C-alpha cells in the first residue's frame, strides 16, 4: 500500500522534475561557433563638413567589436620639431632656462626636453621646450561634435551560429526574395529577423543617455542568445537580443571610452600628421548559445539515477 | 548465486562504461588559452598593377580574424564638395530644382542636399545635388579583380594552447633545425605540423567555389581542435583542423562579406581620398580545446556513485 | 550502535566534503561578459626621432589585443616599378637575361618577372628583374630599435565583468575622488585596483627577457581571473592578475611575432608608400571568471544524493 503510494510519488517526482524540467534526457552543447558581420550606415555633419562611415567607424572591417566616433579632438599639421610642452605635464612650467634640464623624457610627456624654456601657446605662462610631434594636442587641438545624427545611424548585424555536435546552423536573416531588409525595422516580435538596429534604439534599450555617451564615450554590448531546443523544429531556435552597457557609469575614473589615431601626410617631403582623439561608442556584439538534443545515453544514465533514489526513498520509508 | 552474478554484471557495467568510456576518472578543463599568429603570403596582379599582402590583408597585425581582399570597387579623387547624388538613393532623381529641398540628410544618402538638381554622371537623367565626399561611389567607381591568384596564396597559422589547471602547453609547429617550414605543405597526416594552408585548399575543404567566394565574398572558419588526454605522452595531444564556411550561402540577403576603407591624401593642401569597397574572404581561426588528466577525487566520487547504484541494483533484484 | 556510528560518519563526510568544499549548494555561471579598454602611454626615441603611442601601438582602438612595436625594418619611397628581385627568392640570381623568363609570379617573390637580369642593390651579384613595389625590402630596408624605453611604457587595462544569471557587475577600478589612478602603481596586494602595468613588469612576471622579446617579438598574456563567491560581500570578488608568455620560446621556427604595414603617400601624383616590418610585443588580455551563488535547487538535489548514498553505505555495512 504505502509502499505503492511511495513508489508513485517518487516516480512522479523523478520523471516530471528531472526529465521534463532539467532536460536530463538531452545531450547539451554550450557555446556555438558564430560569425558576426556588422555594417554601419549614416552620415553626420560638422561645421562645413560631412562625415561618412569610413571616418567614424574604426575599425572598418565589419566585425564583432567596433567604435562609432561621436566627438574628436584633432590636432593638425603635426611634425617632428621643438614646441612648448603641455602645461599639464609635471615639471613643465618654467620661469627660466635653468628650470628645465636637457634630455629628460617623461613617459607621460610629449617629447624630449631641449633644455630651454619657451612661451606657451596661450600666454602669459612658459613651459619647458620639448622635441617631438608638435604642436602638442593640449595646446593646438580643436573639438568637433559629430554625434548629432548618430542616434539615427543604423547597424546591420549578421549572425550565423553552428552546433558541430548537432550539425545545426541558423542565421538571424530569413531567406526572402522581397526587399525586406531594405525597408524593415527591428522589433522583438514582428521583425525579429531584421537585424538592423538604430544606435539610439540600442542606447535607450541599454538605459543610457545619448548626450552623456556621445560626450564621454562608452561601451554598449549587443548580446545575442541562441537558446535552441533541437528536438523541436528549427523555426523554434530564434535569436534573443539584449542591450546593456558594459563599461562603468558610476565610476568617474573608469567611465568613458576614447582612443587616438592619426592621419599621415607628406607636405614638401616632410612627414606631417593629423592627430585625432576620438570619443565614441564602442559596440560589442556578444553571442551566447546553448542547444540540446535528445540522446539515449543521458536518458538511460539519468533513468538509472532515478530508479537508484526511488529505491533508497523506499528503504528509508521502511527505515 | 544470482546475487553474485548480478554483482558481477553491475560492476562490469560500471567499471567499463563509466570509467573507461565516459572518462569519469579524469578532471577536465574545457577551453584553453590560445595564441593565433597568422601571416599571409602571395602577390596578385591587376591591369598594370601588382598587389602585395599589405594591400589585400586587412587588418595587417596578424591575428585570428583577417580578410583577404579579392575584389575592390575604388573611387579616386574624392573631396568635400557638391556632386549629383547616387540615383539609387530615394528621392534622388529630379526634374527641376523645385523637386529637391535644401538641408535634407538621408542616412542612406551620400551627403547634404544643396537644393539644386544637376545632371547625373551618366545622362540623360538628373539627380538632386548633395554636398559631401564627391564624386559618389555609385557614379565614379571602377572594379578590379585581384583574386586570380588568391587560391595560390598561403596562410601560416601559429597556434599555442595552454591548460593552466594542468600546466600543459603545446604548439602546432615542431622544433626542427631543418628548413621544414620553408618547403612543407600541410597534410592531415604526413605534415600535420606544417600549418601553412593554401587559400584554395581551405576553400575546397569548406566545400565552396573560389569564383563565387572571390566575387561576393564570405567567411571561412579555420577550426583547430585540441582534444588532449594528458594521461598519455604529449606526442598524443595533436591539432585537428576543420574548414567550413561560417556565413550563409543559401540566403541572398545575408550572403557575402564586404567593407569600405579609404586612403587619404593631401593634394595642394586639400584633403583627398580614395574610397575602396572591398569584397574578400574573411578567415576566422577558431581554436577549441578539451583536456583531461587523471585525478583521485573524481575517481573516488564516481566509484562511490558506482557502488551506490550497485547496491540499489542488488536490492531491486531482491525486490 | 554501529549503525548509528556509520550514520554519523557518512553524514559528516557528505556534509563537509560535498557542500563545504565542492560547493554543491551553489548554482555556478562559468564565463562572464567582460569589457577590456586598454590605453598605452610612453614615448621612445630613435636617431633624431621621437615615437609616440600612435606610431607603435597597432591596432589603436584600445582593445583586448594590441601590439607594441619595439623594432621596425622600414623601406621608404616604394612605388610600382621595375627593380632587382630579392636575392633570397628562389631562382632570383641570374647570370644573363636568358636565365630569367618573363611572366613568372612567385607567391613568395616580390613581383612579376620582366624577363631581364639587372645588377643587385649590393654588387657584384645580379638578380632577375621584377615589376612591383620597389625597391624590395630585402635590399633597401633600414632597421630602427624603438624599445629602449618600452619597459618604462605603461598599460592601463580597464575591465568590467558581468554575471547575467546573478545580475552582478564589478570593475577593476575603484570609485575614488582622489587622483589615485594618476599616481598609483599596480601591486598584487596594496594597489590591486590600480590596473596600470609597466611593460617591463609584465615581461618580468612572465619570466622573459626584454632584450630577447624586443628583438624577435612575442606574445604575452595578461590573464584576469574573477573567481567570485556571490554569497559573500562584493568586496570579496576581486581580480587576480597573471602574466605569462603565450607563444613558444624554445621553438626557433614558431618563436617571435612580427607584421608588415605601410604608410601611403602621393608625391607628384604617384602613389608612394613606406613599408614597415614591425617586431613587437603583442599584449593579450584574457579574462576568466567563475561565480557561484547559493540556490535551493542544487541544495535539495545534492542533499537527496547525499541521503541516497548514506542509505547504500548503511545497507552494505549490513551486507
Ligand atoms: N547599416 C545598415 N542599415 C540599413 N541597411 C543596411 C545596412 N547595411 C546594409 N544594409 C542593406 O542590407 C543589405 C545587406 O548589406 P550588404 O552589405 O550585405 O549588401 P550591399 O548591398 O552590398 O551593401 P551596401 O548597402 O553597402 O551596398 C543590403 O541591401 C544593404 O543595402
Ligand atoms: N604565409 C606563409 N607561407 C609560407 N611560408 C611562410 C608564411 N609565413 C611565414 N612563412 C615562413 O615560415 C617561417 C615563419 O615565418 P615568421 O614570420 O615566423 O618568420 P620570418 O622569416 O621573419 O617571416 P618572413 O617570411 O616575413 O621573413 C619563416 O621562415 C617564413 O619564411
Ligand atoms: N597607460 C597609462 N598609464 C598611466 N596613466 C594612464 C594611462 N592611460 C590612462 N591613464 C590615466 O588614467 C585615467 C584614465 O584614462 P582615460 O583614458 O580614462 O581618461 P583621460 O584623462 O581622458 O585619458 P588621457 O590621459 O589620454 O587624457 C586618466 O586620468 C589618464 O590620465
Ligand atoms: C621636478 O619634480 C620634482 C618632484 O616634484 C621636484 O623635486 C623637482 O624640483 C622638479 N624639477 C625642477 C627643476 O624644479
Ligand atoms: C531620427 O530622426 C528623426 C527626424 O527625422 C528624429 O525625430 C529622431 O529623434 C531621430 N532619432 C533619435 C535622435 O533618436
Ligand atoms: C520623397 O519621398 C516621399 C515618400 O515617397 C514622397 O512622398 C515625396 O513626394 C518625395 N519628395 C518629393 C519632393 O517628391
Ligand atoms: C596554383 O598555381 C598552379 C600553377 O602554378 C595552378 O595549376 C593551380 O590550380 C593554382 N591553385 C589553384 C588555382 O587552386
Ligand atoms: C628554377 O628552379 C628549378 C628548380 O630548382 C630549376 O630546375 C630551374 O632550372 C630554375 N630556373 C632556371 C632558369 O634555372
Ligand atoms: C625605467 O626608468 C628607470 C630610470 O628612470 C630605470 O632605472 C628603469 O630600469 C626603467 N625600467 C626598466 C628598464 O625596466
Residue numbers in the entry:
A (entry chain B), B (entry chain A), C (entry chain C): 43 to 361
Source paper text:
The P2X2 receptor (P2X2R) is an adenosine triphosphate (ATP)-gated ion channel with few small-molecule modulators that exhibit poor pharmacological properties. It is known to be involved in the auditory system and has been proposed as a drug target for age- and noise-related hearing loss. Each P2X2 protomer is composed of intracellular N and C termini and two transmembrane (TM) helices (outer TM1 and pore-lining TM2) connected by a voluminous extracellular domain. Three P2X2 protomers intertwine to form the trimeric receptor, with each subunit adopting a dolphin-like shape, as first established for the zebrafish P2X4R (zfP2X4R).
Using cryo-EM we determined two distinct structures (obtained from two different purification approaches) with ATP bound in the orthosteric binding sites and a uniquely constricted pore, consistent with desensitized state conformations. In conformation II, the left flipper (residues 288–299) adopts an alternate pose compared to conformation I, abrogating an interaction with ATP. As a result of this alternate conformation, there is one less interaction with ATP and a larger opening to the ATP-binding pocket. During cryo-EM data processing from the second purification, we were able to classify two distinct conformational states; the apo closed state conformation in addition to the alternate ATP-bound desensitized state conformation II, which has not been described before. We speculate that the adjusted purification conditions (depletion of ATP using apyrase and addition of Ca2+-ions) allowed us to capture both conformations. Finally, when conformation II was used for MD simulations, the left flipper starts in an “open pocket” conformation, with an initial distance between S296 and the α-phosphate of ATP of 8.0 Å. The left flipper of conformation II was also mobile during the simulations moving between distances above and below 4.0 Å for the aforementioned interaction (S19 D–F).
